Amino acid sequence: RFLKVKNWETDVVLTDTLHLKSTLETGCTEHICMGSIMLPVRTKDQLFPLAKEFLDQYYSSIKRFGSKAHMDRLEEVNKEIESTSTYQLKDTELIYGAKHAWRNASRCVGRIQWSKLQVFDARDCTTAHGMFNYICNHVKYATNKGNLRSAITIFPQRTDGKHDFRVWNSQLIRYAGYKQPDGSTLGDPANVQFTEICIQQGWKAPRGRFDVLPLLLQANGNDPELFQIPPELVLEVPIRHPKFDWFKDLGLKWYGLPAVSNMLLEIGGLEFSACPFSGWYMGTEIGVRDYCDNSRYNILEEVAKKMDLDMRKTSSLWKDQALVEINIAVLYSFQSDKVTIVDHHSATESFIKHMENEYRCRGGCPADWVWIVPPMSGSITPVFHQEMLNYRLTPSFEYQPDPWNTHVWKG
Amino acid sequence: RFLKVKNWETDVVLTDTLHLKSTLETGCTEHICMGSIMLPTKDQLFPLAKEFLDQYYSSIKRFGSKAHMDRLEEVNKEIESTSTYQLKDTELIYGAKHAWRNASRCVGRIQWSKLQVFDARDCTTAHGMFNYICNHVKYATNKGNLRSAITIFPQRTDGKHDFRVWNSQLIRYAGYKQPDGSTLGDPANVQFTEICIQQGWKAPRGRFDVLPLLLQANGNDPELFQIPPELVLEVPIRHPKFDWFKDLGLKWYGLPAVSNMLLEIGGLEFSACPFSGWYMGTEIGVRDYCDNSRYNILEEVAKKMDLDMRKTSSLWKDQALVEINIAVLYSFQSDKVTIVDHHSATESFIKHMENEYRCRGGCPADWVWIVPPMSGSITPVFHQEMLNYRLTPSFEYQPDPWNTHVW
Ligand code: HEM
Ligand code: HEM
Ligand SMILES: Cc1cc(N)nc(COC[C@H]2C[C@H](OCc3cc(C)cc(N)n3)CN2)c1
Ligand SMILES: Cc1cc(N)nc(COC[C@H]2C[C@H](OCc3cc(C)cc(N)n3)CN2)c1
Ligand SMILES: C[C@H](O)[C@H](O)[C@H]1CNc2nc(N)[nH]c(=O)c2N1
Ligand SMILES: C[C@H](O)[C@H](O)[C@H]1CNc2nc(N)[nH]c(=O)c2N1
Numbered sequence: 102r103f104l105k106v107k108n109w110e111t112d113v114v115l116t117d118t119l120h121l122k123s124t125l126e127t128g129c130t131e132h133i134c135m136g137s138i139m140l141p142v143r144t145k146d147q148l149f150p151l152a153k154e155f156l157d158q159y160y161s162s163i164k165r166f167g168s169k170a171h172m173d174r175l176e177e178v179n180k181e182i183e184s185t186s187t188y189q190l191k192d193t194e195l196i197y198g199a200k201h202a203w204r205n206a207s208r209c210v211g212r213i214q215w216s217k218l219q220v221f222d223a224r225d226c227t228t229a230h231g232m233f234n235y236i237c238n239h240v241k242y243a244t245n246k247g248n249l250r251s252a253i254t255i256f257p258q259r260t261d262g263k264h265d266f267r268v269w270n271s272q273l274i275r276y277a278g279y280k281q282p283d284g285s286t287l288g289d290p291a292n293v294q295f296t297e298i299c300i301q302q303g304w305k306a307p308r309g310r311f312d313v314l315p316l317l318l319q320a321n322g323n324d325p326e327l328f329q330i331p332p333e334l335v336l337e338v339p340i341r342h343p344k345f346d347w348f349k350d351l352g353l354k355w356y357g358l359p360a361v362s363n364m365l366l367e368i369g370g371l372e373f374s375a376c377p378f379s380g381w382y383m384g385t386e387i388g389v390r391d392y393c394d395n396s397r398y399n400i401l402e403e404v405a406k407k408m409d410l411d412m413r414k415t416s417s418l419w420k421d422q423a424l425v426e427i428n429i430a431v432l433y434s435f436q437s438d439k440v441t442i443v444d445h446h447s448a449t450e451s452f453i454k455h456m457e458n459e460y461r462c463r464g465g466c467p468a469d470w471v472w473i474v475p476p477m478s479g480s481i482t483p484v485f486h487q488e489m490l491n492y493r494l495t496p497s498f499e500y501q502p503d504p505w506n507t508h509v510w511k512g
Numbered sequence: 513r514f515l516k517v518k519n520w521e522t523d524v525v526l527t528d529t530l531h532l533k534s535t536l537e538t539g540c541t542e543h544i545c546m547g548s549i550m551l552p553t554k555d556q557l558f559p560l561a562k563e564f565l566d567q568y569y570s571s572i573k574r575f576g577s578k579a580h581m582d583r584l585e586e587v588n589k590e591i592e593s594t595s596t597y598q599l600k601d602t603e604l605i606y607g608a609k610h611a612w613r614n615a616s617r618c619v620g621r622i623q624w625s626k627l628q629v630f631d632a633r634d635c636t637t638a639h640g641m642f643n644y645i646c647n648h649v650k651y652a653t654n655k656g657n658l659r660s661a662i663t664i665f666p667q668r669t670d671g672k673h674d675f676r677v678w679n680s681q682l683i684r685y686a687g688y689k690q691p692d693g694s695t696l697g698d699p700a701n702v703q704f705t706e707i708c709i710q711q712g713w714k715a716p717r718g719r720f721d722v723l724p725l726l727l728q729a730n731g732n733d734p735e736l737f738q739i740p741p742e743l744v745l746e747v748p749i750r751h752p753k754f755d756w757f758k759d760l761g762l763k764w765y766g767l768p769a770v771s772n773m774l775l776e777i778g779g780l781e782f783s784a785c786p787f788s789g790w791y792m793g794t795e796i797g798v799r800d801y802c803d804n805s806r807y808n809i810l811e812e813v814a815k816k817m818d819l820d821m822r823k824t825s826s827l828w829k830d831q832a833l834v835e836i837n838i839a840v841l842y843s844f845q846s847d848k849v850t851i852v853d854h855h856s857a858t859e860s861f862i863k864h865m866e867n868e869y870r871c872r873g874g875c876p877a878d879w880v881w882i883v884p885p886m887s888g889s890i891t892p893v894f895h896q897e898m899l900n901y902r903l904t905p906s907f908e909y910q911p912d913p914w915n916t917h918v919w
């Protein structure tokens with residue numbers, strides 16, 4: 102079957118066939134759409150088909166489908182599964198798998214870059230100290246003094262589910278949040294729970310508004326251990342505005358390296374529960390969400406106050422006015438300091454070009470409109486006007502529950 | 513089978529049971545989500561009638577009464593005998609209000625129970641349709657104090673005698689393809705304008721020409737009528753701080769009035785059912801004014817503001833966008849024409865969702881349409897999980913009549 106998508110601005114029509122290769126479920130049915138729902142130990146049994154499907158895809162990508170090398174690898178993996186109940190990826194397959202999980206990530210607007218991903222193989226890691234070292238190297242490499250490079254570090258896969266490698270942090274670099282006795286929050290409200298765990302584990306909290314959290318690292322199913330990222334490795338940008346000189350006095354800064362550390366990478370049925378990956382920021386992630394969500398730094402009021410906007414009625418669009426200024430400031434600050442960032446116009450335009458190319462060479466590009474459309478100025482970006490088809494391909498990145506909810510404490 | 517929706521800003525969780533009533537299909541499957549796709553006999557009719565009358569009698573706390581049974585019997589007899597049936601006035605009003613209630617793409621539904629229903633099932637000619645429509649326009653406009661209304665023409669019969677309004681909205685501006693190569697007026701309406709010209713209309717060839725109505729009675733060839741200019745409330749657009757803004761020569765009309773949709777009630781089909789509310793500011797200032805395939809004025813406005821249009825990263829488009837939208841709201845407010853901003857409307861909608869969850873067990877909502885086209889995440893609907901599903905009575909898309917009509 103063929104499925105068409107239309108862009109209602111350009112009338113360009115694309116034809117999707119790639120969706121036929123999708124097997125995993127969406128959450129939706131013929132009677133309900135779950136498109137806005139954020140979230141709608143394998144046996145041999147289930148494992149060889151998953152491995153075979155992956156290796157067929159890999160060997161096709163290298164133009165060696167059906168070759169002796171392809172057949173020998175299938176046999177070798179099969180014997181390894183029946184004998185050890187799992188298998189190890191070759192380095193090449195690991196690299197291919199990790200790039201494809203990114204290529205397949207339907208919520209990711211930054212996918213034009215998918216084939217340029219530096220893969221760091223950390224499958225020989227055994228301890229939390231080993232993990233800390235790998236992560237520091239990743240941070241240093243990715244940061245590259247402001248000229249950001251995409252990277253992923255891949256720790257040992259799940260075995261019995263009792264020996265999992267996990268990074269307890271949701272991102273490698275994030276600011277602490279502290280709930281005060283009066284009910285207010287100091288720092289980032291998103292990270293209160295994790296910050297409380299760190300303190301419990303023995304972290305001495307500076308208790309300021311932008312304290313970089315320690316890493317809390319779990320190797321081999323052991324209790325997690327605390328480590329401080331060397332401050333010299335943590336690149337940060339003070340936020341100022343090109344025309345408003347009072348903007349600096351808001352005391353705002355942000356870190357340069359967006360690095361997700363709590364997702365699960367699935368390749369050929371294997372589960373990599375610790376796979377921190379990083380890119381660079383689109384400006385709205387910081388200027389819209391991190392700064393202006395009510396449940397985050399929530400700076401809209403203070404900024405609009407300083408701008409002397411009419412705050413007496415929502416219909417003055419004071420919030421919208423302050424919003425644009427904050428986002429100008431984020432982009433200006435990053436650019437002035439020579440730290441990679443992309444604006445939402447540039448990034449959505451690139452994604453549309455990526456998507457059309459993918460339709461041509463690959464037969465499709467799964468995309469989740471709810472996430473791809475930026476959180477400000479939606480319809481003045483080309484993605485708003487683009488019909489998208491959302492479906493799940495493997496290799497993939499998946500959500501996993503926070504480890505404090507599941508961990509069996511050794512003590 | 514029982515489903516939860518979470519608000520990620522407030523942690524409030526609602527439980528949806530109403531989706532289990534859902535009849536029609538979404539376009540989605542377990543394998544593929546189509547959430548962002550714009551458009552994915554006697555024997556058939558009695559089930560649909562029954563389902564509807566059951567919900568109606570339920571709503572007036574008379575479920576399983578003799579009056580309920582008797583009506584089911586009567587409609588059953590009527591379908592058996594005539595191949596269709598006629599709604600009671602009470603049922604018509606109920607169905608129309610519920611079609612709005614069920615409109616998953618409508619952020620303005622807190623208002624759903626205050627809908628004025630004009631029963632035009634006694635209409636027979638295009639001139640009668642023109643009359644009904646003028647009365648709707650005047651009633652709804654109410655000198656700027658807008659009131660929601662729907663006018664319901666006769667239901668489909670054998671489908672060769674359809675009433676249709678060919679216009680997509682009762683009030684829209686003409687679009688003219690130019691020798692130049694550009695477009696004058698609204699490019700969205702170039703084709704409909706040509707059809708009007710072809711059917712005889714004398715176009716003034718301006719930027720903001722109110723289109724004539726093209727009305728189809730009883731499956732006949734449609735006819736042209738000019739809405740009395742005096743019934744079309746328009747608003748010149750100025751800015752509370754930028755004096756040059758008025759020089760752009762922009763205006764918009766007060767009454768958003770959809771006229772090309774099909775109302776389905778208890779299996780009966782009302783192919784001409786124009787309905788109207790009032791505007792949310794972004795519809796005009798973001799979509800009508802700034803879409804590239806619409807009036808596309810961002811460039812001109814940005815220039816008048818003297819912004820750095822060199823780099824996308826100066827966010828000049830974004831800055832101009834906010835100002836255009838401040839001006840739209842300010843202009844409607846100053847002229848006392850009802851308008852709602854996107855903060856107000858979305859806040860109202862969250863309250864409505866809570867009401868519907870509490871009283872009805874849910875509210876079908878299409879997040880893709882509900883979240884405004886600017887400043888998404890600073891409105892509360894962005895952070896609200898929504899389940900989308902189809903309930904009847906409903907408003908449905910139907911194809912433009914010219915691709916169908918046999919002249
Ligand atoms: C290279 C620069 C990149 C940019 C500008 C970018 C942009 C984004 C943005 C804006 C989002 C939505 C983020 C949010 O709203 O929370 C996102 C989501 C995501 N991207 Fe990227 N991306 C980049 C690189 C990467 C890389 C290297 C990977 C993995 C190898 C990746 C995989 C993902 C995934 C899995 C999500 C979904 C996250 C979730 O569900 O919470 N992206 N991307
Ligand atoms: C009273 C003020 C109202 C407001 C502020 C309002 C708001 C909106 C908005 C902003 C949209 C999206 C329009 C677009 O993006 O093109 C919409 C869609 C819609 N509304 Fe309303 N609404 C109102 C009244 C009504 C009424 C009176 C009805 C029917 C009786 C209705 C039924 C619909 C339908 C069916 C759609 C979807 C149209 C489509 O699919 O193209 N609404 N509403
Ligand atoms: C790699 C990368 C680059 C870039 N520019 N930006 C990002 C941001 O991704 C951050 C990730 C972490 C939050 O996760 C929230 C979340 C919650 C839940 C319940 C599920 C889910 N998939 N995601 C939102 N997206 C990642
Ligand atoms: C009643 C009402 C109130 C209000 N404030 N705003 C409106 C605007 O609705 C206008 C209607 C006409 C366009 O039609 C778009 C469209 C196209 C297609 C192909 C399908 C579809 N369902 N809708 C967009 N929605 C309507
Ligand atoms: C309920 C809703 O799905 C939720 O707020 C989503 C909407 N779209 C998003 N889009 C992006 N990029 N990131 C997000 O966190 C969200 N949140
Ligand atoms: C392709 C995509 O579905 C399309 O551009 C939608 C997105 N959301 C929308 N939302 C509203 N309210 N109105 C629209 O016309 C659209 N267009």
Ligand SMILES: [Zn+2]
Pocket residue numbers: 129133134135136540544545546547
């Ligand atoms: Zn769906």
